Coordinates of C-alpha atoms in Angstrom, one line a residue:
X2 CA 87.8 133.0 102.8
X3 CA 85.4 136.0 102.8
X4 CA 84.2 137.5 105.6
X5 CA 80.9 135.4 106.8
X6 CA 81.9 132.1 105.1
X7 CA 80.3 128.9 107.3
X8 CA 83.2 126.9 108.2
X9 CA 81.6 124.2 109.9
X10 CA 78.3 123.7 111.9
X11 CA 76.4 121.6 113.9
X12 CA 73.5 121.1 116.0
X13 CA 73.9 119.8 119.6
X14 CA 70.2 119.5 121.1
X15 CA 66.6 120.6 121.2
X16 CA 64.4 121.6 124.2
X17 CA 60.7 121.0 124.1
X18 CA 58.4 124.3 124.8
X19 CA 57.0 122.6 127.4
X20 CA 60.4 121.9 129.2
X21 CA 61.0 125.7 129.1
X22 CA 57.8 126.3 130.2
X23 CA 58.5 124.1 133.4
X24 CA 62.0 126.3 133.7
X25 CA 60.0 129.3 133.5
X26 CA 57.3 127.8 135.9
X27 CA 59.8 128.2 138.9
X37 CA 53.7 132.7 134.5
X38 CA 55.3 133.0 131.0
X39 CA 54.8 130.5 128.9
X40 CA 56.9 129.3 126.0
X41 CA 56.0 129.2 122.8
X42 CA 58.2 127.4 120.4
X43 CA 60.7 124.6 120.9
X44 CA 64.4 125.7 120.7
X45 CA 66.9 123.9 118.6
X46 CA 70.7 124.3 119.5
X47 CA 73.3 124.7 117.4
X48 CA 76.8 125.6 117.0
X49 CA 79.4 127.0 113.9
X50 CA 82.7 128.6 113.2
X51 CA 83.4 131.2 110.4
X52 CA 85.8 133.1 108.0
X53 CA 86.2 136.9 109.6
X54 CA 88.7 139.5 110.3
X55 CA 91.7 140.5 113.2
X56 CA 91.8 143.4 114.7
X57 CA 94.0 144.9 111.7
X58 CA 91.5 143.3 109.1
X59 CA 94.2 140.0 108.7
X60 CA 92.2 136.7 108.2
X61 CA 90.8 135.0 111.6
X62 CA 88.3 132.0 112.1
X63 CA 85.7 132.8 115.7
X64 CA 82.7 130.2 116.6
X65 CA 79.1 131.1 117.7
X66 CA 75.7 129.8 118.8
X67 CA 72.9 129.5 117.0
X68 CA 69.5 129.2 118.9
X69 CA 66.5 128.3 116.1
X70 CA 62.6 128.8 117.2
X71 CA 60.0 126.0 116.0
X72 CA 56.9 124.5 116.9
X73 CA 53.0 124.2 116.1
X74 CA 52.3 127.2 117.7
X75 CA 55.5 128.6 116.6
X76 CA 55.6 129.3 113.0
X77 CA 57.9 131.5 111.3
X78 CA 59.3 134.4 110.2
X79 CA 61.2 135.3 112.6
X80 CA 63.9 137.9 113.2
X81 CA 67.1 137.5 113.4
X82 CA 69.1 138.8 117.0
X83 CA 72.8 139.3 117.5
X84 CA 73.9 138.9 120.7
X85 CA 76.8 140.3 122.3
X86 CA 78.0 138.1 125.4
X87 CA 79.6 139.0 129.3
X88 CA 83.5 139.4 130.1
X89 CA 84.5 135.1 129.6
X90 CA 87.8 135.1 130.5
X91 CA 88.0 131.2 130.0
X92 CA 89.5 131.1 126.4
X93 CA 88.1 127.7 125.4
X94 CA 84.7 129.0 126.2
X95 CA 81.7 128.3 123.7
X96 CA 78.4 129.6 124.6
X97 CA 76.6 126.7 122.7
X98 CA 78.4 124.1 124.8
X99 CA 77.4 126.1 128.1
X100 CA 73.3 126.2 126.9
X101 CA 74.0 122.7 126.3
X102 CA 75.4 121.5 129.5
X103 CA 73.1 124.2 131.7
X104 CA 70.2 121.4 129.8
X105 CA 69.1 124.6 128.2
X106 CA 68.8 127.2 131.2
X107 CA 69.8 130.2 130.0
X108 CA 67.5 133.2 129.6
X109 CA 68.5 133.3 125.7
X110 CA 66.5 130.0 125.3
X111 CA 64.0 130.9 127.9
X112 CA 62.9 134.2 127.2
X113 CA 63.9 134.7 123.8
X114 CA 64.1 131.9 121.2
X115 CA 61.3 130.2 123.3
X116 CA 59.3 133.3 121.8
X117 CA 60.3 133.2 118.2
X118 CA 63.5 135.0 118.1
X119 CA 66.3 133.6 116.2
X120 CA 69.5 134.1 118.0
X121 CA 73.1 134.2 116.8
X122 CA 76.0 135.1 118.9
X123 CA 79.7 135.1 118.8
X124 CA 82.0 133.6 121.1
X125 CA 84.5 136.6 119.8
X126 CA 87.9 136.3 118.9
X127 CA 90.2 134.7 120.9
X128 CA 87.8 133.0 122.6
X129 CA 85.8 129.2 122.2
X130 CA 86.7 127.6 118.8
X131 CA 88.4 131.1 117.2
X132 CA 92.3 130.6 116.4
X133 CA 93.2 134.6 117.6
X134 CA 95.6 134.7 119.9
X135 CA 93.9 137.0 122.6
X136 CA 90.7 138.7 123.1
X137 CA 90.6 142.1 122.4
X138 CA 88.4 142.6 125.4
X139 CA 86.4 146.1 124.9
X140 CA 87.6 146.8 121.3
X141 CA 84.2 148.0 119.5
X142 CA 85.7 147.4 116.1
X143 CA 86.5 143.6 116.4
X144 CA 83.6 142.9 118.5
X145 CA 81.3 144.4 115.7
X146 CA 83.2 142.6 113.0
X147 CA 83.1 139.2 115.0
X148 CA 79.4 140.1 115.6
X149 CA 78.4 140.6 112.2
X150 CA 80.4 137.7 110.6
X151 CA 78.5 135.5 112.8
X152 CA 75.3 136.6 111.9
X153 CA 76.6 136.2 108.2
X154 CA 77.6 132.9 109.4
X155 CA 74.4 131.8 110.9
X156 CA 72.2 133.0 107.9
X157 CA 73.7 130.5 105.8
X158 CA 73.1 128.0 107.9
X159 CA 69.6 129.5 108.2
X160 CA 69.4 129.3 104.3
X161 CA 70.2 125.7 104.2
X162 CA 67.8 124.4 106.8
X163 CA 65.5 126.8 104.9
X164 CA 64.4 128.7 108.1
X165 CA 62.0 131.2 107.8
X166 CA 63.0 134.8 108.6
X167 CA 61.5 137.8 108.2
X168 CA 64.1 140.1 107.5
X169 CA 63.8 142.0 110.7
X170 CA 67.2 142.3 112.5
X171 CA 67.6 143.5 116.3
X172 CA 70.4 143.1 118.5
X173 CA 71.2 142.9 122.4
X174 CA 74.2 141.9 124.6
X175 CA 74.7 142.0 128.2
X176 CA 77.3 143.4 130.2
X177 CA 80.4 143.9 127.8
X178 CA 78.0 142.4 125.5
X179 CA 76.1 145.5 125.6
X180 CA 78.9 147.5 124.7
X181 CA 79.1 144.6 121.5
X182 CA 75.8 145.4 121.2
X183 CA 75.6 148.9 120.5
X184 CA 79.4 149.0 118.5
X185 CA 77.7 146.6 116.3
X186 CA 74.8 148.4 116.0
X187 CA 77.3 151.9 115.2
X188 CA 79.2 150.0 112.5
X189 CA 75.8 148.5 110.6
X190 CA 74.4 152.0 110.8
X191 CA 77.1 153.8 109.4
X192 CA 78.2 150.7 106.2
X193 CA 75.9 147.8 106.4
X194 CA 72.1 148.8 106.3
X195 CA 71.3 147.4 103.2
X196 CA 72.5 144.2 104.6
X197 CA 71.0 144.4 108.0
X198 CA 67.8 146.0 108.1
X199 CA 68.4 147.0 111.9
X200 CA 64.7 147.5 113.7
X201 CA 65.9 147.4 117.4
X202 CA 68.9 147.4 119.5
X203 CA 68.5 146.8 123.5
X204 CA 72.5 147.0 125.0
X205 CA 72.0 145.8 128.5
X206 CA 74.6 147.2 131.4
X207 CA 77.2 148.0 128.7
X208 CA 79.8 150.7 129.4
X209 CA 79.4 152.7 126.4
X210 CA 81.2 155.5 128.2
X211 CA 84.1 153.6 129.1
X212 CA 86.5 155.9 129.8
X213 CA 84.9 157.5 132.2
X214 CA 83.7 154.3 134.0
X215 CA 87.3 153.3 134.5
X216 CA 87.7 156.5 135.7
X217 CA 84.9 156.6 138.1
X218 CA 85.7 153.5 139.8
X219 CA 89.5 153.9 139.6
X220 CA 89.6 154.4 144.3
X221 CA 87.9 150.8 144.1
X222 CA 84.9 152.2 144.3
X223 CA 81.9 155.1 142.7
X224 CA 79.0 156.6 143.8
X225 CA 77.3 153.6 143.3
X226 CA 79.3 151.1 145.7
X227 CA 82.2 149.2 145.9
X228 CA 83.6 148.2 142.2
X229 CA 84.6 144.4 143.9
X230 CA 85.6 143.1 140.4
X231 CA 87.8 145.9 139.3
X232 CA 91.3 143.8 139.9
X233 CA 90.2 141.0 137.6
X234 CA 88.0 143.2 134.8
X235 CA 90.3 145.9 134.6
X236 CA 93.5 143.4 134.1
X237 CA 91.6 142.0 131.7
X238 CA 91.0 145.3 130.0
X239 CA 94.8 146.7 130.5
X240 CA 96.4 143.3 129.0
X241 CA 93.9 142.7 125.9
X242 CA 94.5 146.9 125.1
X243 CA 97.8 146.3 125.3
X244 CA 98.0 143.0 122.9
X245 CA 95.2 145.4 120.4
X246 CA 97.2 148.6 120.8
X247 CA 100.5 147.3 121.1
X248 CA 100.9 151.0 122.8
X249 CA 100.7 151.1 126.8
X250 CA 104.1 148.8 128.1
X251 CA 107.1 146.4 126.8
X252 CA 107.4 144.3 130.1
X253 CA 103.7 144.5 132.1
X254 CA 106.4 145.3 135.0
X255 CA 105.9 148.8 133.9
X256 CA 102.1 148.8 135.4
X257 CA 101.5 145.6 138.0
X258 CA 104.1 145.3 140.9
X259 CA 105.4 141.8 141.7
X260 CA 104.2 138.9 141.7
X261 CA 101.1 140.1 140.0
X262 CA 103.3 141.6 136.5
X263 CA 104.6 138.0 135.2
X264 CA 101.1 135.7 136.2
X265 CA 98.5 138.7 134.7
X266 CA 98.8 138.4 131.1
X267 CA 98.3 134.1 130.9
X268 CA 95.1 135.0 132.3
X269 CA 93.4 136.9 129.9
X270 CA 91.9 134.5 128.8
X271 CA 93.3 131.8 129.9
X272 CA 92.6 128.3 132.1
X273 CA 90.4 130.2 134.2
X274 CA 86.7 131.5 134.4
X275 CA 86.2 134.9 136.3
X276 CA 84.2 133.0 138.7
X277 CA 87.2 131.0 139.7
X278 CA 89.5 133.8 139.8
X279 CA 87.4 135.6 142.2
X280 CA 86.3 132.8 144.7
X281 CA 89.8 131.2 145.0
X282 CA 91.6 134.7 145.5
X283 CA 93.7 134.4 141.9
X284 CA 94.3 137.9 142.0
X285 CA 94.2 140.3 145.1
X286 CA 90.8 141.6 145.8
X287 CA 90.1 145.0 145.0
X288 CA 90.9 146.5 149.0
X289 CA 94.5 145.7 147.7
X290 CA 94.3 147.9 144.7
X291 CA 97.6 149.9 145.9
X292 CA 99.6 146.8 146.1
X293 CA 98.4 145.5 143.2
X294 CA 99.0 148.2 140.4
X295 CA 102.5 150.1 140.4
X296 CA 101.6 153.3 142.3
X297 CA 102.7 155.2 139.3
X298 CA 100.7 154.0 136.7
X299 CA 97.6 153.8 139.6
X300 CA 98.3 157.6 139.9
X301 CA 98.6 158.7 136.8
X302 CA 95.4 157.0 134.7
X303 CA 93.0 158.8 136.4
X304 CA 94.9 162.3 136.3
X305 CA 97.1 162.0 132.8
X306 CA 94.4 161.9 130.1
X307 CA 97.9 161.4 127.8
X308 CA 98.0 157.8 129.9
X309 CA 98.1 155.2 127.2
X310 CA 95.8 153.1 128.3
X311 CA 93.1 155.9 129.3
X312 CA 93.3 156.8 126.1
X313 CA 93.2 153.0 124.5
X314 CA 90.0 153.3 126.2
X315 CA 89.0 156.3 125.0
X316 CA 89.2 155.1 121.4
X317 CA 86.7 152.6 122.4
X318 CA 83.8 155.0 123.6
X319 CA 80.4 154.6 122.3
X320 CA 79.2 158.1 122.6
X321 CA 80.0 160.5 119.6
X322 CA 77.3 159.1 116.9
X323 CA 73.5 159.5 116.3
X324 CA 71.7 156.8 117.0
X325 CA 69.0 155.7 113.9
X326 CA 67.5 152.7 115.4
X327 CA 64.9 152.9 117.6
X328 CA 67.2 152.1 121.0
X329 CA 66.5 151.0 124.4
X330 CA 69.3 151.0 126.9
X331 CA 68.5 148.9 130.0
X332 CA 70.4 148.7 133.6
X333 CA 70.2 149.1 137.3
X334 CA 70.9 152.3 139.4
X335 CA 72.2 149.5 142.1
X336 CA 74.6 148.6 139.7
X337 CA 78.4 149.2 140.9
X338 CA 81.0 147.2 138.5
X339 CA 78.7 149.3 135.5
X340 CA 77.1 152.4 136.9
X341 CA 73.5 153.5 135.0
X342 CA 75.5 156.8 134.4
X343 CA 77.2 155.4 131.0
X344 CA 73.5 154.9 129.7
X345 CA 72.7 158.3 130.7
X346 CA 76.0 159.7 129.5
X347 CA 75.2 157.9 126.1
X348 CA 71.7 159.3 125.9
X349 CA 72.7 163.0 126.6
X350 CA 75.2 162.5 124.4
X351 CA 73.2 161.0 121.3
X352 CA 70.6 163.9 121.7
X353 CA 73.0 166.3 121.7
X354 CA 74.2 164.9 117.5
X355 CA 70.4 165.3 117.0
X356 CA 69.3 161.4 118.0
X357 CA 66.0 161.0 120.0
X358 CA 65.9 157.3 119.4
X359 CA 67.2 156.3 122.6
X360 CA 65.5 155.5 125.5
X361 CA 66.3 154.3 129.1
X362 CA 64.7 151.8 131.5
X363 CA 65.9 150.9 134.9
X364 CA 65.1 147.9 136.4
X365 CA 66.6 148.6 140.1
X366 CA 65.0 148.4 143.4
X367 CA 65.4 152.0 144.1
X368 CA 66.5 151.4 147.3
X369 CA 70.5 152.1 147.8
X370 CA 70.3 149.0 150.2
X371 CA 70.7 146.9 146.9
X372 CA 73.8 149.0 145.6
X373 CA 76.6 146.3 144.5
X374 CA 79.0 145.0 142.5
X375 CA 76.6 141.7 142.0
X376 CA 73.2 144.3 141.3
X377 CA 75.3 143.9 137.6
X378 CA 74.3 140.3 137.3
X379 CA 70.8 140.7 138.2
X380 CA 70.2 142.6 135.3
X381 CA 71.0 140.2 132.6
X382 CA 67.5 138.2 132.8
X383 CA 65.9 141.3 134.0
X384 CA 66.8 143.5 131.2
X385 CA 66.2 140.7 128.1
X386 CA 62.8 140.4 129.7
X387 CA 62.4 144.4 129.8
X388 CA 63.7 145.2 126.8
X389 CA 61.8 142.4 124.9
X390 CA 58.5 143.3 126.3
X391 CA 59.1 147.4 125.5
X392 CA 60.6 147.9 122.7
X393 CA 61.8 144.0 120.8
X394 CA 58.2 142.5 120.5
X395 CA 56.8 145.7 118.8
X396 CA 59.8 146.1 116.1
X397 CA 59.2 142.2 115.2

């Protein structure tokens, strides 16, 4: 099947604008209903083989809500739970989730992948932090969707944007790379908002190597950077043989079944799964822990390295939103991404912080904050006036 074909789809519920006004009540008003729906489509591995992935759909409607409307990618957290489908999750949170809330509840179509490996897709890992799969899975979905859209005979206007949170803003802006440099004829890209991505993620692995960075204590770094090691290692196929080579015992033979696996992060890190991040030196062999952050030859530094988002110019207007009390993604990677994009000649990005300014507020759980923060930041300065 070709790239973008609609497997299957179907709708699971429908929340009245009313009902999100209530959510949003406890003031911003919704203005369209939001329909829910789900689908799973033809796309490509990480070596271009054949793979199948799944993805929500979130459709805007309502007497007050007529079309167009554009169309927005959206690139989702670190899910660690494999059978994971984002639609599934809106539908059992009875839609609340800042998506519906803040965005289709205001005429924005949204489409996101559930990536590969993950909900419905038959890959056989994630390839957590690869910018070329998660751009491909990003993009099919959003071929996906639009055929659905065609069917249903949903008005859009054209305009695309796209926006992800978290690892889903470093989705966000690889996907936003790969449509500039091959797909702008097909995508006519008009904003991109990456929330709390770690577009220089090298160097954030780097930073918060000790445990911790200037920021505060990196208290998910066990659990996020397994997650990272083990899927770079079933991408690349280059960093170890037996994970022996970089976890010490027990940790080595119970890391890679979680990533993804039968657990969510959440439950990984309140029932103590994995040692918390105080135990880093017991945790990693003390080789490997010395040598990635002063080898840059270290396979997996350099796995990372191949996924930076920093050496390209920028052509979409770009608004790159986070929190300077942020500690599991320090602001820096926006800032190192913005010096960086001016320096190839792009001024089209632009940074907005939505921390308290107060160093007080510095952690690890600052990260989360930002999701809802940022969609609402970044829709009111820069999404609403590309529409």
């Amino acid at each position: 099947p070709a790239r973008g074909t609609l497997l299957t789809s179907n709708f699971l519920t429908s929340y009245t604008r009313d009902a999100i006004s209530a959510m949003l009540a406890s003031p911003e008003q919704a203005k369209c209903n939001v329909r829910v729906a789900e689908f799973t489509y033809a796309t490509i591995g990480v070596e271009g083989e054949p793979a199948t992935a799944s993805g929500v759909l979130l459709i805007p409607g309502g007497e007050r809500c007529s079309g167009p409307y554009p169309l927005l990618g959206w690139g989702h957290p670190t899910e660690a739970l494999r059978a994971q489908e984002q639609a599934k999750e809106i539908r059992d949170a009875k839609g609340d989730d800042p998506l519906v809330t803040r965005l289709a509840s205001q005429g924005y179509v949204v489409v996101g992948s559930d990536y590969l490996g993950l909900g419905k897709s038959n890959y056989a890992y994630h390839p957590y932090l690869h910018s070329a799969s998660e751009a491909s899975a990003t993009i099919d979905a959003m071929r996906a969707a639009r055929s659905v859209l065609q069917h249903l005979k949903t008005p859009l206007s054209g305009k695309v944007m796209l926006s992800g949170y978290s690892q889903g803003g470093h989705t966000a802006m690889a996907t936003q790379r790969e449509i500039e440099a091959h797909l702008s004829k097909e995508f006519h890209l008009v904003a991109s908002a990456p929330i709390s991505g770690p577009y220089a993620l090298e160097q954030t692995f780097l930073d918060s190597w000790s445990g911790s960075n200037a920021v505060g204590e990196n208290t998910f770094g066990i659990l996020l950077g397994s997650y990272a090691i083990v899927a770079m290692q079933h991408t690349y196929k280059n960093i170890y043989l037996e994970p022996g080579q970089v976890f010490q015992d027990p940790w080595a033979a119970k890391v890679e079944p979680l990533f993804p696996g039968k657990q969510s992060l959440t439950d990984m890190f309140l029932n103590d799964t994995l040692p918390s991040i105080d135990k880093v030196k017991s945790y990693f062999q003390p080789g490997f822990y010395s040598d990635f952050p002063s080898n840059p030859a270290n396979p997996f530094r350099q796995d990372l390295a191949r996924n930076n988002l920093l050496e390209w110019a920028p052509q979409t207007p770009t608004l790159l939103c986070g929190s300077s009390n942020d500690a599991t993604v320090p602001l820096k990677n926006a800032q190192t991404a913005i010096a960086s994009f001016q320096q190839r000649g792009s001024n089209q990005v632009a940074l907005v912080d939505t921390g308290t300014g107060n160093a007080s507020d510095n952690s690890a759980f600052a990260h989360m904050l930002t999701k809802e923060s940022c969609i609402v930041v970044v829709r009111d300065q820069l999404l609403d006036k590309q529409r």
